Design an enzyme around this catalytic site. Structure first.
Site, mmCIF file in Angstrom:
data_model
loop_
_atom_site.group_PDB
_atom_site.id
_atom_site.type_symbol
_atom_site.label_atom_id
_atom_site.label_comp_id
_atom_site.label_asym_id
_atom_site.label_seq_id
_atom_site.Cartn_x
_atom_site.Cartn_y
_atom_site.Cartn_z
ATOM 1 N N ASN A 1 -56.115 57.740 -8.239
ATOM 2 C CA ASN A 1 -56.971 57.798 -7.076
ATOM 3 C C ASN A 1 -56.596 56.802 -5.984
ATOM 4 O O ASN A 1 -57.377 56.631 -5.040
ATOM 5 C CB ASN A 1 -58.428 57.581 -7.475
ATOM 6 C CG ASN A 1 -59.020 58.772 -8.158
ATOM 7 O OD1 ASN A 1 -58.812 59.909 -7.723
ATOM 8 N ND2 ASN A 1 -59.838 58.531 -9.184
ATOM 9 N N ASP B 1 -64.285 54.789 -10.197
ATOM 10 C CA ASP B 1 -63.161 55.525 -10.761
ATOM 11 C C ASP B 1 -61.835 55.035 -10.153
ATOM 12 O O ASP B 1 -60.906 55.826 -9.961
ATOM 13 C CB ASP B 1 -63.363 57.029 -10.537
ATOM 14 C CG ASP B 1 -62.592 57.925 -11.539
ATOM 15 O OD1 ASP B 1 -62.050 57.447 -12.567
ATOM 16 O OD2 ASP B 1 -62.532 59.151 -11.244
ATOM 17 N N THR C 1 -92.713 43.486 -15.247
ATOM 18 C CA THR C 1 -93.231 42.149 -15.520
ATOM 19 C C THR C 1 -92.521 41.525 -16.721
ATOM 20 O O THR C 1 -92.432 42.157 -17.785
ATOM 21 C CB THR C 1 -94.734 42.208 -15.767
ATOM 22 O OG1 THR C 1 -95.028 43.423 -16.462
ATOM 23 C CG2 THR C 1 -95.504 42.186 -14.432
ATOM 24 N N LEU D 1 -52.022 70.149 -5.427
ATOM 25 C CA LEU D 1 -52.032 68.700 -5.371
ATOM 26 C C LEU D 1 -52.826 68.082 -6.522
ATOM 27 O O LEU D 1 -52.415 67.064 -7.085
ATOM 28 C CB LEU D 1 -52.586 68.252 -4.014
ATOM 29 C CG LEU D 1 -51.692 68.494 -2.786
ATOM 30 C CD1 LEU D 1 -52.360 67.923 -1.543
ATOM 31 C CD2 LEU D 1 -50.311 67.871 -3.016
ATOM 32 N N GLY D 2 -53.956 68.669 -6.886
ATOM 33 C CA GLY D 2 -54.763 68.152 -7.973
ATOM 34 C C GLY D 2 -55.715 69.231 -8.419
ATOM 35 O O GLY D 2 -56.061 70.129 -7.644
ATOM 36 N N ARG D 3 -56.126 69.161 -9.681
ATOM 37 C CA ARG D 3 -57.028 70.152 -10.256
ATOM 38 C C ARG D 3 -57.971 69.494 -11.251
ATOM 39 O O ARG D 3 -57.534 68.733 -12.117
ATOM 40 C CB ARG D 3 -56.259 71.264 -10.951
ATOM 41 C CG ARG D 3 -57.122 72.438 -11.321
ATOM 42 C CD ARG D 3 -56.239 73.528 -11.893
ATOM 43 N NE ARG D 3 -55.848 74.509 -10.878
ATOM 44 C CZ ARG D 3 -56.667 75.391 -10.315
ATOM 45 N NH1 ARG D 3 -57.939 75.486 -10.673
ATOM 46 N NH2 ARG D 3 -56.195 76.211 -9.377
ATOM 47 N N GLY D 4 -59.252 69.803 -11.128
ATOM 48 C CA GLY D 4 -60.260 69.246 -11.991
ATOM 49 C C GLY D 4 -61.150 70.359 -12.466
ATOM 50 O O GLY D 4 -60.859 71.529 -12.205
ATOM 51 N N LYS D 5 -62.242 70.016 -13.151
ATOM 52 C CA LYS D 5 -63.068 71.050 -13.758
ATOM 53 C C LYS D 5 -63.764 71.907 -12.708
ATOM 54 O O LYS D 5 -63.982 73.096 -12.943
ATOM 55 C CB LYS D 5 -64.089 70.422 -14.711
ATOM 56 N N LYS E 1 -59.633 70.586 -0.248
ATOM 57 C CA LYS E 1 -60.268 70.412 -1.557
ATOM 58 C C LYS E 1 -61.344 71.475 -1.763
ATOM 59 O O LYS E 1 -62.439 71.380 -1.196
ATOM 60 C CB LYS E 1 -60.877 69.016 -1.702
ATOM 61 C CG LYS E 1 -61.692 68.838 -2.997
ATOM 62 C CD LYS E 1 -61.659 67.420 -3.481
ATOM 63 C CE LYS E 1 -62.538 67.252 -4.716
ATOM 64 N NZ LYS E 1 -62.956 65.838 -4.724
ATOM 65 N N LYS F 1 -58.463 53.910 -10.261
ATOM 66 C CA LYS F 1 -57.358 54.029 -11.194
ATOM 67 C C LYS F 1 -56.177 54.517 -10.381
ATOM 68 O O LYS F 1 -56.352 54.910 -9.220
ATOM 69 C CB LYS F 1 -57.695 54.999 -12.336
ATOM 70 C CG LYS F 1 -57.991 56.416 -11.841
ATOM 71 C CD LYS F 1 -58.616 57.273 -12.945
ATOM 72 C CE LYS F 1 -58.338 58.747 -12.657
ATOM 73 N NZ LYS F 1 -59.545 59.604 -12.619
ATOM 74 N N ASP G 1 -61.424 60.340 -3.872
ATOM 75 C CA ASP G 1 -62.205 60.786 -5.015
ATOM 76 C C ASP G 1 -63.442 59.951 -5.255
ATOM 77 O O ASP G 1 -63.477 59.073 -6.124
ATOM 78 C CB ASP G 1 -61.377 60.809 -6.297
ATOM 79 C CG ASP G 1 -62.161 61.377 -7.468
ATOM 80 O OD1 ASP G 1 -63.276 61.938 -7.239
ATOM 81 O OD2 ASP G 1 -61.644 61.293 -8.611
HETATM 82 O O1 LIG Z 1 -60.676 64.131 -4.335
HETATM 83 C C1 LIG Z 1 -59.557 63.962 -4.830
HETATM 84 N N1 LIG Z 1 -59.370 63.811 -6.147
HETATM 85 C C2 LIG Z 1 -60.445 64.000 -7.112
HETATM 86 C C3 LIG Z 1 -60.480 65.409 -7.645
HETATM 87 C C4 LIG Z 1 -59.443 66.291 -7.372
HETATM 88 C C5 LIG Z 1 -59.495 67.602 -7.814
HETATM 89 C C6 LIG Z 1 -60.582 68.044 -8.542
HETATM 90 C C7 LIG Z 1 -61.607 67.173 -8.835
HETATM 91 C C8 LIG Z 1 -61.557 65.862 -8.389
HETATM 92 C C9 LIG Z 1 -58.316 63.930 -3.988
HETATM 93 C C10 LIG Z 1 -58.403 64.262 -2.635
HETATM 94 C C11 LIG Z 1 -57.270 64.311 -1.834
HETATM 95 C C12 LIG Z 1 -56.013 64.045 -2.365
HETATM 96 C C13 LIG Z 1 -55.914 63.706 -3.711
HETATM 97 C C14 LIG Z 1 -57.056 63.634 -4.495
HETATM 98 O O2 LIG Z 1 -57.040 63.223 -5.803
HETATM 99 C C15 LIG Z 1 -55.963 63.685 -6.630
HETATM 100 C C16 LIG Z 1 -54.853 62.683 -6.630
HETATM 101 O O3 LIG Z 1 -53.637 63.372 -6.924
HETATM 102 C C17 LIG Z 1 -52.591 63.070 -6.016
HETATM 103 C C18 LIG Z 1 -51.878 64.341 -5.632
HETATM 104 N N2 LIG Z 1 -51.049 64.162 -4.443
HETATM 105 C C19 LIG Z 1 -51.568 64.059 -3.169
HETATM 106 C C20 LIG Z 1 -50.735 63.968 -2.023
HETATM 107 C C21 LIG Z 1 -51.341 63.883 -0.823
HETATM 108 N N3 LIG Z 1 -52.705 63.933 -0.774
HETATM 109 N N4 LIG Z 1 -53.505 63.770 0.353
HETATM 110 C C22 LIG Z 1 -54.744 63.847 -0.116
HETATM 111 C C23 LIG Z 1 -54.806 64.044 -1.507
HETATM 112 C C24 LIG Z 1 -53.445 64.109 -1.905
HETATM 113 N N5 LIG Z 1 -52.913 64.035 -3.123
#
Ligand SMILES: O=C(NCc1ccccc1)c1ccc2cc1OCCOCCNc1ccn3ncc-2c3n1
Length: 266
Positions: free
Chosen positions: A135, A130, A170, A20-24, A43, A132, A151
């Site tokens: 998010n 953040d 002061t 679904l998502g990837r960060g550092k 996560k 945007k 996020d």
């Molecule tokens: O904490 C989150 N993001 C910050 C972050 C992510 C990875 C590494 C470092 C920081 C984060 C948490 C939950 C979800 C999405 C998040 O954001 C990515 C958005 O992409 C959207 C990707 N598609 C979806 C679809 C359904 N869902 N249901 C929950 C989520 C999610 N994303």
């Protein structure tokens, strides 16, 4: 949160297919709780970062999630797991994905939801920092569902102006620098909601330049003319709403509560 130390894989099956998502320091993977079959967003967060224990950063994210748990416009936290190297935040799954030109009427309905979520964060002294499109999630794509803010990695709990008056010190000793400086505040979030509103209504990023240095300059000096072809189908109230937000001086920006009372959303 109560942190569970039994294995995550015992309660949940990770879905196949693209993450679904990837960060550092973290990746989010769709999963299914073995009991319900209910879908969630798991996560996986590394504790160690650049060689140093950063558990406290995950703990901070959880605390913001819990602060906002009665906020229906913020993603829900279901469970927390921990291993030798990871903490796992089992999050609510927002089946619509990211928000992303929209029709003006969709932006009105969605922007009112976003502002309720942000307003209630500000109510709790949280600045997201953040905001945007990546998010802002939707509970459905077709039809457009409800928004979920995710996020809180850059989020801060901000001191009141009274603690900003004490940390000031002061007055006859303060340098001209400090008197010219504008700190990060609730209004910093509202700027971003201004940019987001502009982009959703038109499809153009208002300050994007040919390079980064241009984008930075535009941000600090450009007075938006609106007046591009994309604004002809837009209401005057829609342009006024943006103008209350993209004010360079932070003190002069609209707050979330005034946005919610603006005639564009009323
Ligand atoms: O904490 C989150 N993001 C910050 C972050 C992510 C990875 C590494 C470092 C920081 C984060 C948490 C939950 C979800 C999405 C998040 O954001 C990515 C958005 O992409 C959207 C990707 N598609 C979806 C679809 C359904 N869902 N249901 C929950 C989520 C999610 N994303």
């Amino acid at each position: 949160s109560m942190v569970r130390t039994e294995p995550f894989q015992d309660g949940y099956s990770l879905c196949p297919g693209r993450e679904l998502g990837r960060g550092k320091f973290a990746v989010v993977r769709k999963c299914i709780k073995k009991d319900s079959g209910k879908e969630f967003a798991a996560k996986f967060m590394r504790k160690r970062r650049k060689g140093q224990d950063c558990r406290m950063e995950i703990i901070h994210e959880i605390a913001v999630l819990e602060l906002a748990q009665d906020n229906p416009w913020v993603i829900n936290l279901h469970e927390v797991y921990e291993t030798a190297s990871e903490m796992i935040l089992v999050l609510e799954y927002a089946a619509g994905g990211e928000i992303f030109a929209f029709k003006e009427k969709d932006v009105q309905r969605l922007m009112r939801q976003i502002l309720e979520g942000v307003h209630f964060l500000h109510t709790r002294d949280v600045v997201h920092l953040d905001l945007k499109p990546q998010n802002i999630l939707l509970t459905s794509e077709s039809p457009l569902g409800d928004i979920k803010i995710v996020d809180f990695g850059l989020s801060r709990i901000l001191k009141n102006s009274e603690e900003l008056r004490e940390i000031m010190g002061t007055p006859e000793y303060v340098a001209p620098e400090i008197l010219s400086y504008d700190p990060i505040s609730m209004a910093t979030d509202m700027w971003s909601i201004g940019v987001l509103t502009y982009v959703m209504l038109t499809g153009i990023s208002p300050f994007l330049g040919n390079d980064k240095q241009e984008t930075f300059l535009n941000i600090s000096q450009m007075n938006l003319s609106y007046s591009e072809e994309e604004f002809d189908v837009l209401s005057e109230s829609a342009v006024d709403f943006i103008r209350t937000l993209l004010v360079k001086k932070p003190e002069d920006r609209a707050t979330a509560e005034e946005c919610l009372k603006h005639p564009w959303l009323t």
